[PDB]
Design an enzyme around this catalytic site. Structure first.
Site, PDB file in Angstrom:
ATOM      1  N   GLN A  29      52.642  30.912  39.313  1.00 50.23           N
ATOM      2  CA  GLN A  29      51.643  29.813  39.865  1.00 50.23           C
ATOM      3  C   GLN A  29      52.036  29.324  41.176  1.00 50.23           C
ATOM      4  O   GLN A  29      52.749  30.152  42.105  1.00 50.23           O
ATOM      5  CB  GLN A  29      51.639  28.653  39.087  1.00 50.23           C
ATOM      6  CG  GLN A  29      50.953  29.171  37.423  1.00 50.23           C
ATOM      7  CD  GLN A  29      49.338  29.541  37.452  1.00 50.23           C
ATOM      8  OE1 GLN A  29      48.697  29.258  38.449  1.00 50.23           O
ATOM      9  NE2 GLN A  29      48.998  30.344  36.325  1.00 50.23           N
ATOM     10  N   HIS A  51      28.359  52.106  30.842  1.00 50.52           N
ATOM     11  CA  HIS A  51      28.251  52.690  32.360  1.00 50.52           C
ATOM     12  C   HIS A  51      29.249  51.891  33.145  1.00 50.52           C
ATOM     13  O   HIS A  51      30.059  52.405  34.021  1.00 50.52           O
ATOM     14  CB  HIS A  51      26.837  52.654  33.019  1.00 50.52           C
ATOM     15  CG  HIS A  51      26.919  52.632  34.502  1.00 50.52           C
ATOM     16  ND1 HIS A  51      27.381  53.898  34.919  1.00 50.52           N
ATOM     17  CD2 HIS A  51      26.871  51.828  35.250  1.00 50.52           C
ATOM     18  CE1 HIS A  51      27.261  53.834  36.233  1.00 50.52           C
ATOM     19  NE2 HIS A  51      27.157  52.499  36.524  1.00 50.52           N
ATOM     20  N   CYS A  99      24.906  58.047  32.220  1.00 57.28           N
ATOM     21  CA  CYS A  99      24.330  58.622  33.330  1.00 57.28           C
ATOM     22  C   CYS A  99      23.989  59.995  32.998  1.00 57.28           C
ATOM     23  O   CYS A  99      23.316  60.803  33.718  1.00 57.28           O
ATOM     24  CB  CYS A  99      25.332  58.256  34.526  1.00 57.28           C
ATOM     25  SG  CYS A  99      25.562  56.901  35.188  1.00 57.28           S
ATOM     26  N   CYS A 142      29.584  59.065  33.218  1.00 62.31           N
ATOM     27  CA  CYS A 142      29.491  58.576  32.032  1.00 62.31           C
ATOM     28  C   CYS A 142      28.541  59.095  31.261  1.00 62.31           C
ATOM     29  O   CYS A 142      27.570  59.727  31.790  1.00 62.31           O
ATOM     30  CB  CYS A 142      29.470  57.127  32.126  1.00 62.31           C
ATOM     31  SG  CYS A 142      27.725  56.279  32.328  1.00 62.31           S
ATOM     32  N   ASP A 182      42.190  42.652  34.527  1.00 60.95           N
ATOM     33  CA  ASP A 182      41.088  42.319  33.749  1.00 60.95           C
ATOM     34  C   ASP A 182      40.072  41.644  34.213  1.00 60.95           C
ATOM     35  O   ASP A 182      40.343  40.675  35.242  1.00 60.95           O
ATOM     36  CB  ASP A 182      41.666  41.644  32.542  1.00 60.95           C
ATOM     37  CG  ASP A 182      41.751  40.256  32.890  1.00 60.95           C
ATOM     38  OD1 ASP A 182      42.952  39.692  33.437  1.00 60.95           O
ATOM     39  OD2 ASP A 182      40.945  39.394  32.550  1.00 60.95           O
ATOM     40  N   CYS A 186      28.427  59.291  38.589  1.00 63.15           N
ATOM     41  CA  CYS A 186      28.971  58.740  37.637  1.00 63.15           C
ATOM     42  C   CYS A 186      29.118  59.852  36.539  1.00 63.15           C
ATOM     43  O   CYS A 186      27.835  60.456  36.029  1.00 63.15           O
ATOM     44  CB  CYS A 186      28.529  57.335  37.216  1.00 63.15           C
ATOM     45  SG  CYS A 186      29.254  56.850  35.844  1.00 63.15           S
ATOM     46  N   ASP A 231      45.872  37.096  26.647  1.00 60.80           N
ATOM     47  CA  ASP A 231      46.230  36.129  27.661  1.00 60.80           C
ATOM     48  C   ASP A 231      46.496  34.843  26.614  1.00 60.80           C
ATOM     49  O   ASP A 231      46.216  35.076  25.412  1.00 60.80           O
ATOM     50  CB  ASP A 231      44.880  35.596  28.300  1.00 60.80           C
ATOM     51  CG  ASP A 231      45.170  34.764  29.477  1.00 60.80           C
ATOM     52  OD1 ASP A 231      46.408  34.414  29.622  1.00 60.80           O
ATOM     53  OD2 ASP A 231      43.872  34.265  30.261  1.00 60.80           O
ATOM     54  N   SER A 232      47.375  33.837  27.029  1.00 63.67           N
ATOM     55  CA  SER A 232      48.026  33.159  26.343  1.00 63.67           C
ATOM     56  C   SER A 232      47.427  31.564  26.013  1.00 63.67           C
ATOM     57  O   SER A 232      47.756  30.829  25.143  1.00 63.67           O
ATOM     58  CB  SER A 232      49.328  32.545  27.233  1.00 63.67           C
ATOM     59  OG  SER A 232      48.855  32.192  28.486  1.00 63.67           O
TER      60      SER A 232
END
Ligand SMILES: Nc1nc2cc3nc(NCCc4ccc(CCO)cc4)[nH]c3cc2c(=O)[nH]1
Ligand SMILES: Nc1nc2cc3nc(NCCc4ccc(CCO)cc4)[nH]c3cc2c(=O)[nH]1
Ligand SMILES: [Cl-]
Ligand SMILES: [Cl-]
Ligand SMILES: [Zn+2]
Ligand SMILES: [Zn+2]
Lengths: 370, 370
Positions: free
Chosen positions: A190, A336, A310, A307, A267, A305, A93-94
């Site tokens: 914008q 997780h 889990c 992962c 994000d 899940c 991000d800027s």
């Protein structure tokens, strides 16, 4: 070798798309979720763990990194990728949003001067330069995230400034040969919640030309109904053949609805931050692991899940860790949650590819909100 | 299948020994360092990472676990091993030290009553029971760690009580068939810094009979010279054919000197706790990674260390993480420090096996203190 940037759409369903972005450092499967790594770390995770969850790309922040450890310092040390040990694409991000979120500020047509949360400066030129020093793969234009709510007049003036800044960002990026040849540049739409301003912004960005287009100025307190209403008209204004990135979004249901509206990239700090705070995402909705009801619950965080968390640890154990303030609690919750988000994105991609995303969205919501 | 307990000495050099303890859940190479996992976690490390560093056994604490999450609760959930995901041996301290270190207390011949840092009770019987509920592999007798300094009279009275408690611990352990058949019980020598009391304590413990013998009552402020002086006469008093465990020790040089004096097992919070605080152990001595001199240092924490942290990340990056208060900083520092400790133990074991430990000790000190 992979190109600097190539976005290909493999399948569509309504406004939803699935495909890939190819870049020099790797392939990004879309729709994509980017774990946030604000201070050159995805909090509580080794990069290998971030990758193991399925992430193709992470997000860094111009604002935080310019303050600590410093952009020039990171460049001297070999760039952000080497510094933190993540060798795949990074989007930065800027600064346009975080400066106004976290800093005293002085705003002008030149940019923003601010006190660190020492005085510092951001501008389209300096922002692009910082992102270069970091070695960002996807560079965001320097913009202004209009506060919400905004009057039409203020939203227009803000958007207009952002569009002038978008052109300056484009020119700064292009003037740096190494950056122009190896990174991509995304513009940020914008216009607050106003259709005409969103259209003017989209037109300005398309005239300049970018590798991808973010919908900025949302996830700023407007709530989901309004966000979705704005997406309904805003996303179709963007070039169809480039990625559409919704900044700062969001909860699992926000993501599903945004994909239904043509968004390709996301994000959010939610899975990491709320993970550390004890919130675990499950297919049956979020749970707070601190709750006493989990103290003797031998089940994993989520029943399906895949992962590593889990597979190995119980709710009861993680409940204990979070209650005790143990670092391993933050680690496990975060792994997780990020894995859950990636599994969500995978289910989204697969369902679009198979022409059953509408049904997936319906089934997901029915169960998540049961 | 492995026996309940078998200690075999493979090689000796002076008072130093190297060998193995075989237990049902695994083999422990000696001299051994046990990472501390007080609250059912080695802070900031997954158990797999603890194992990857070379640890054969970890330490848990009766005192902390009885308070949170509770011993009965852990038993209901399947025991400490299943709860935290460490399937290898666990030694548990008995509470005798931590209660007086961390708690209001009421001491008597029966045991100790205390306020949680709710009122709670420990006694030889309750301590052994808690260690059973946890499913500890090496159970420590419930003792009293005499404060330092202590007068000879007070040290004697304290030691005598500990020896009565050692017998009660023995009987409690033996009365529980499952525990007696599957775990081991270590006695703890007391007597402060006094040779005659240390001898009386050793004699009492040997008469009772234990699977191993700890030297208690040290690392309580006496300093290395005094600790070594007490070890000089105390360790030979213990049965030669059983492990000798020095509780709460220590710095790398403490460990080397203690091995020179016949110690086989160690635990210490130093590598974990001081790691989180920014102290990294290296073969050239400890460094504090927070120091500005490391801000642009691209070298690993230690130049020779084989750990995953030193293979991948720079001092500069870890400096940034620790300065920023990032969880990954704690994770990386801790993994490195525990790996360093295990590499130290490996070098000790190899050098004893090869009859060059004296030379190793000398070379280690020359470089570590250069
Ligand atoms: N350059 C630029 N960056 C942005 C970042 C944003 N991030 C958001 N939303 C984030 C909101 C958000 C805040 C906190 C949490 C976690 C709570 O546990 C989740 C989401 N909106 C945003 C808009 C912009 C924008 O126009 N321009
Ligand atoms: N049951 C029992 N347990 C003990 C634990 C001990 N632990 C110590 N020393 C620990 C000292 C110690 C304290 C803090 C740090 C880290 C600083 O960053 C390192 C060492 N001495 C000890 C003596 C006994 C003892 O007689 N009986
Ligand atoms: Cl976060
Ligand atoms: Cl610790
Ligand atoms: Zn999971
Ligand atoms: Zn290392």
């Amino acid at each position: 070798d992979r190109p600097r940037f190539s976005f290909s759409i493999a399948a569509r369903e309504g406004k939803a798309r699935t495909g890939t972005i190819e870049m020099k450092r790797g392939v990004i499967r879309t729709p994509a979720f980017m774990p946030v790594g604000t201070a050159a770390t995805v909090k509580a995770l080794k990069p290998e763990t971030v990758r193991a969850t399925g992430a193709d790309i992470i997000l860094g922040n111009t604002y935080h990194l310019m303050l600590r450890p410093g952009a020039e310092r990171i460049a001297k040390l070999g760039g952000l990728h080497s510094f933190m040990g993540w060798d795949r694409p990074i989007l930065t991000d800027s600064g346009g949003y975080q400066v106004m979120s976290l800093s005293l500020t002085k705003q002008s047509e030149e940019g923003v001067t601010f006190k660190s949360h020492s005085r510092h400066m951001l501008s389209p030129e300096r922002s692009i330069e910082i992102q270069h020093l970091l070695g960002s793969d996807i560079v965001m234009a320097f913009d202004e995230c209009t506060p919400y709510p905004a009057t039409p007049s203020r939203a227009a003036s803000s958007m207009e400034r952002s569009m002038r800044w978008a052109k300056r960002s484009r020119d700064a990026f292009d003037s740096r040969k190494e950056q122009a040849e190896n990174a991509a540049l995304f513009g940020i739409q914008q216009g607050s919640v106003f259709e005409n301003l969103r259209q003017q912004s989209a037109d300005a960005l398309a005239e300049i030309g970018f590798d991808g287009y973010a919908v900025g100025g949302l996830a700023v307190g407007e709530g989901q109904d309004e966000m979705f209403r704005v997406l309904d008209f805003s996303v179709p204004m963007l070039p169809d053949d480039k990625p559409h990135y919704l900044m700062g979004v969001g909860k699992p249901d926000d993501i599903v609805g945004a994909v239904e509206r043509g968004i390709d990239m996301f994000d959010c700090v939610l899975p990491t931050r709320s993970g550390r705070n004890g919130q675990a995402f499950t297919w049956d909705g979020p749970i707070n692991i601190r709750n006493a009801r989990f103290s003797e619950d031998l089940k994993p965080l989520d029943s399906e899940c895949h992962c590593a968390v889990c597979q190995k640890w119980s709710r009861a154990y993680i409940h204990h860790l979070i209650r005790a303030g143990e670092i391993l609690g933050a680690m496990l919750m975060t792994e997780h949650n990020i894995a859950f988000y990636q599994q969500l994105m995978q289910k989204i991609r697969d369902s679009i590819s198979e022409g059953r995303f509408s049904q997936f969205a319906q089934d997901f919501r029915a169960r998540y909100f049961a």
